[PDB]
Symmetry: none
Subunit: 169 residues, 12 copies
């Protein structure tokens, strides 16, 4: 519910982030630079602390459990656009939480940051992730063919987007 808190990212949160990647068995990124080990991340966090291209938030409930992470990357101030990304921790998955966070991300993007467009990438092999964004008003704008090498094969992804104007109506 309104349980969930968003909060900006600090050094302490890095252990948490790192943990959200082991389970993932794909390449993890930090400001377009790739990393596997805590120490790479930490050098990276540090190197990018002043950097305005990406922006992150930890989800915590009322008890301060670590729930997930909302992140906006490729933030472009001339085109007022950003790409959005979400990770829900393994234990906190399948709890109805995604919607709330998507909506809190869109909230911050449009109401605070004053962006024109948020877009995202979903693998086509995630019908129910796809449907979910559609239920939050994301429309498919692209079917990107063999875009990413993830787990043994090139995969296709959907690019889905919402407009500031659609959101605020």
């Amino acid at each position: 519910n309104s349980q969930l808190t968003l909060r900006a990212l600090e050094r302490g949160d890095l252990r948490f982030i790192h943990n959200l990647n082991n389970n993932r068995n794909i390449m993890s990124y930090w400001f377009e630079e790739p990393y596997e080990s805590f120490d790479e991340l930490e050098e990276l966090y540090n190197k990018h602390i002043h950097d305005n291209a990406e922006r992150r938030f930890v989800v915590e409930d009322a008890q301060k459990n670590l729930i997930g992470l909302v992140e906006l990357i490729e933030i472009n101030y001339i085109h007022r656009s950003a790409e959005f990304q979400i990770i829900i921790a393994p234990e906190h998955q399948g709890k109805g939480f995604a919607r709330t966070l998507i909506n809190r991300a869109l909230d911050y993007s449009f109401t605070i940051l004053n962006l024109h467009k948020i877009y995202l990438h979903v693998a086509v092999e995630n019908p129910k992730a796809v449907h979910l964004y559609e239920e939050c008003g994301f429309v498919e704008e692209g079917h990107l063919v063999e875009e990413f090498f993830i787990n043994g094969r090139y995969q296709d992804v959907k690019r889905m987007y919402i407009l500031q104007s659609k959101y605020l109506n």
Copy 2:
């Protein structure tokens, strides 16, 4: 009154947590020498990249027993023109105590008796008229109605720009 015991001390690193515990209640893009921030760590390093900067001067208010009351900021400071923007923040748990006028005196008293300035201006949201009547009462006067100046909380808003001159604050 008990407003008599409020003191101003220049801000320092150990005061940053308090600063950062004041934008979580602002929900507007806080700056540091013209650079935005969200995290404490972002603030930290900015503070460090700006310790030697004359364009802004910050003072923390504590009462007689060192409770942290609020912040007095001064930004955009020409010694050519001798003009500065001023801003004030009171911590929420201290807002029911009419401390504002008192600090505004401290900031004016700093700018004109010590820093030898000529003019002090501030912005105030059109939609914050309580702010306005307070400034007015300290001798501030409207000089601009700034149209859609700052994007704030969903939309662009209009702000009052208000000023007071050194001679006014001083000349009996």
Copy 3:
């Protein structure tokens, strides 16, 4: 007309002499990213200390045959608020030719079609009403009458702050 042939090119080091040959006719404290200067050498190094700075963008105007006409400056630029101050200068030997409107279009056309801004403001001396009626004619509108804002040529003077919004400049 012949205003049609004026072009805007981003400023570069080799253009500094021309810049510096424009404050000798200004007799007011010229800046560079919020830092005063008098000598060419002062300007030079400032330029170098500020090549990578996003807060200001400068464009030199030349006609069809590269005669140096004047300068278009843009300063104080939030991409948070998407606001900028704008200023224009025409070299004296070119002032009898009504080039101003034309450049003001270029600067507005840059700020709103390319740099995607929301608002452009400028200051003008109260005592410079020719400046005012010109800005007005391009859709600029008064938003402030800034009292004793800038110390200028002996005294403190009042300046008009004037603005125009992107939607106005754009919406047929």
Copy 4:
């Protein structure tokens, strides 16, 4: 007719001119710049950076004709954004068809990349058509994606695959 040569420092002026004309914000290794001096500094800053690679087009009389950029090169996903700028003077002389392929050829034969994609304004059907006949195919029609020349315009994302290029 034309030769594709790796860009040198001597070539920046020519790059720089292609940006007074082309009429949007110009980026070097994702860093914006308007000034030649900005361009120059960024140039040295990224001299060994492998994320972007640029070739200049020359002819017999050693005229500077065009530009081919691979940007956003990713050595995990083996993909890169491709752009071509031909100087206005040499505009309609029918070169691009070749260049585009020579570019593709580099990416696929020399660089071992798996996918190349580019953006083209919807408001430029001519361009879309041309790419299509070089083997590019639409994979996205991004809505109000770029703020170009007043309004948030629509862009095709188009792409071709190594396999499809090498085995076409």
Copy 5:
């Protein structure tokens, strides 16, 4: 049973010990070192360097078991040299078979590499055999190639291909 985890700074002592035993010159990102302090410095110096990637092997009680190195990673030719060191204590417990594959799995599924090869002393037929049954095949028998333990020894170069691994 065992987990493969990215190497952290905490792990250097463990790496460093694997070198008093293993008994030749030890290199980090091609830089030699004998001293822990040398190792440490080089570690930070190459923290983001993508030419080499190391995974540490742990178990349930969080014991440090082994090491998997990809070195010489080349993102054009999509190949890398592979090495495995298992701590003497855990030597014969039959782990390598798995590790080797987990390593191969990373290189091929996560890293998109096309070829992996390694060196094995001729004087170590046991080792050659093991790799062979993980799909490695001899492609070179390099003559008096390494000066090991007194004499210039012979080494097999062995290798496996992405395609052959993913489609085996």
Copy 6:
């Protein structure tokens, strides 16, 4: 007359400055740092190019002869005060020029720079320098005893001052 031009100081002017010191047979200063040789000066000029404490001007006539140098040092923005100093070249001396330059310096100090007070130091062994400033409205505010070791002995100097308010009336 209005012959004389003031102009800001550049690198080229340093040779000229240096020349104004040989004849002087006292210590020469540059932003409170002492120098004798061109190369010291040049390192100094460079080190202080961004420095706002001092400010200099070359006098040139209509022909661009080098006439002299007007300088303001110890510029203090909190007390809006500065100390002023003038050198008229040997050849251009005794020509009635001083007044004009004093007045041009006071002009710039008060009308441009917006200073409250300009003060100066004159050796007591310069009755006619003293009288001159008095004729430009400087009043003596101090007789500083054995202030400077110049040429074989400690000397006394007059501190003389004018106020912005007096000037502009």
Copy 7:
């Protein structure tokens, strides 16, 4: 009773407090500062700088009592500006007479300086008097020289000479 000791880094807090009270702009080696962190940084920046020299005053229980500054030390003209700040708590206890001399003693016996001078507000006749009886003499009455506490105040410049001190 009291000891004069060279200022250490430990003493900055104490200096810093003498500036919330004393009520004007505070300078270290001519550099302004309000913040303790500003003070600290400047401190290290000027650690060997010989233009300024500061002694802290302590007592038996090791209480921090006062401050003696020589600033503007000039090794050609052999002169220096002198200031004394006594903590408000210890204000009227009659110490300064001694301190002032101990300061003078340093400047003249240890430092070989020829002249010491100081500034005192006209609006502070008490202070002028005190210095006078330590051998300081007025040499200037500087008109509207400092902007203190609202208005441009008048200051005495007062001074004493080595010869006159050593031979008094």
Copy 8:
């Protein structure tokens, strides 16, 4: 013949080197770092001037024509081995020159540098390059399968080697 001179590499020679790469239509390397443009090379040459892992030589005839380049890379001082590489310019090709240079390279490797082993890589699609080295006493030690992506396909290469002891007998 004894016509041909070897000479160490200097900054001037870089233009020449660069020219030996255009024709090549494969990736060019400099101390394991990849380059295409003169300016990359020049930054690289500079960065590696003190570096002992690689070592180069220009061939010039009696007239000082640029003939080719002999290079030893991956020089390993513990295993006293190095990999050797040769480029004969387009115009000077097919002139009987290779032998002489191979032999001059082997000369320097064994007699000057005191190396144990020189090895090389030849594409299997170069039967006559292969045979040539064999005629200079290189023996095949490996058939490396799909080692390099050169020109549209993974290729196999021969690793060929000679020993210091074989050479000097």
Copy 9:
């Protein structure tokens, strides 16, 4: 014997105290990559200025239970000539145990089996003949009698230079 349990580990910062506790018993000018020292702090910083240096390699000897036995040093190392100077030190409390030969084997065994060297030389004072007969027994042979080479303890002294080649140490 118990010589069998002595191990060699490359030296590191935490081993410096031990090093420095070995020149107080030497009373001769100790070096570090061709730079003298006396204090521990002098040694410390030298160590740090020389961590990445290939010209010298140092190994600390510990027994089975990590008692600190002595030091094996290798200095002046061309890989051109493949030659090195070698030196050994045993802590005094461990000298009554004939450990020397054993370490000298370790150092020779390192230089020739691992570091692939050609020649190892050392110096020995003419006045230290016990040193000499020991080296001799490991296959070292005199190659120089260096006249007044090193100023030592009051005067200049003569030293034996002694060497052994890789082929000798290796060829059965």
Copy 10:
């Protein structure tokens, strides 16, 4: 007696040194740079740790009391000379200790360091310091007139010296 130990100087010893200066009421030096406060010294010690011009030693007895400090400064390797200086702490003064330390300093200078000449400076107002060095075989080589400003007046000093050859006979 042979009680007294000399030992090289470390960071820990600085507190001790500093203490040997308060009592002194003259300027204290560190590698020709002047200091009063611990923090100046410490920056100085650090800056000069690698510096071979000066060399210091703490005296400690068998119990590890701090007894004094022997120092050699202005060490010149071409002229094989050095100036020597000694401080005996206030509490350990007048105990017969000086001789032993002088002799230990001369020992180290000549036997270890291989110097040709040690010289020293004594104020003429220290007849018994002077006589002491003479009893350790220092001969007066100079009466330097008004050499140092120490404590309110310029003073004269004796320069006294011994030769390596005289010592070792």
Copy 11:
């Protein structure tokens, strides 16, 4: 006749030549150097250093005649070591008498120094004599103090006082 001018960078060659002839080790701000390049670097390194001050001697035709050095300048004890080198060509022309005084004049009138002293080889009685008649007096005869030209030679230390110079 002759002018004393502050040394510039242009003058190093001339300094440098005075050292192939003069025939011992040469120092700049106490740093040894043999090479012109060593000299040059040290020059810039010490450009603002006030411990040493050098004047070059010129004549009408702007010939480089000599050198006057104040080294070891101490601003506490107000003393400095003085040296003069005249180029061999201009050796016997009788200039030094003046130079020496002009040097003394600087030290005493412009620099406010209290004592100047110099070293002269015992084996050079001519030189001693000359200084004596410029007011220098022996204060030390340092035994086997310098290793010059084979042997440890003896040197006079000679000196003059401000007071004695200004009141002579």
Copy 12:
């Protein structure tokens, strides 16, 4: 004779070409402060990385009319031990003129009269006996026969180490 006119001047950057034109005739691995080189550019930068180095001192010999004759080098220089290695090179076009002894005097005369050294040693190939008898005649004496010391031109060779002491060179 004409040997009387040979002068020694400390080496400088502009002298590097000449240096580098002397290893092309050496065909042995030339060094610079213990670092090999082949190209002129390698030499250049090494020179620059070593201008402030006391371990080696180099002097160029020119005749009366500045013809470049040869090089005097001094390397490995303790002022602890006061020992140095010395080397000499004469340019080939000047070798038929018996200049060697003369320079060897200059180098000895430098080391002992000026640099105040105690001992000067050099190496000479066993296979270069002309070198040997020349050194011998200047008072140099064999102190070592260094077995397979330097890898040279195909094989490892033996070198004479030879020395002379300051007292010998000086004491009539």
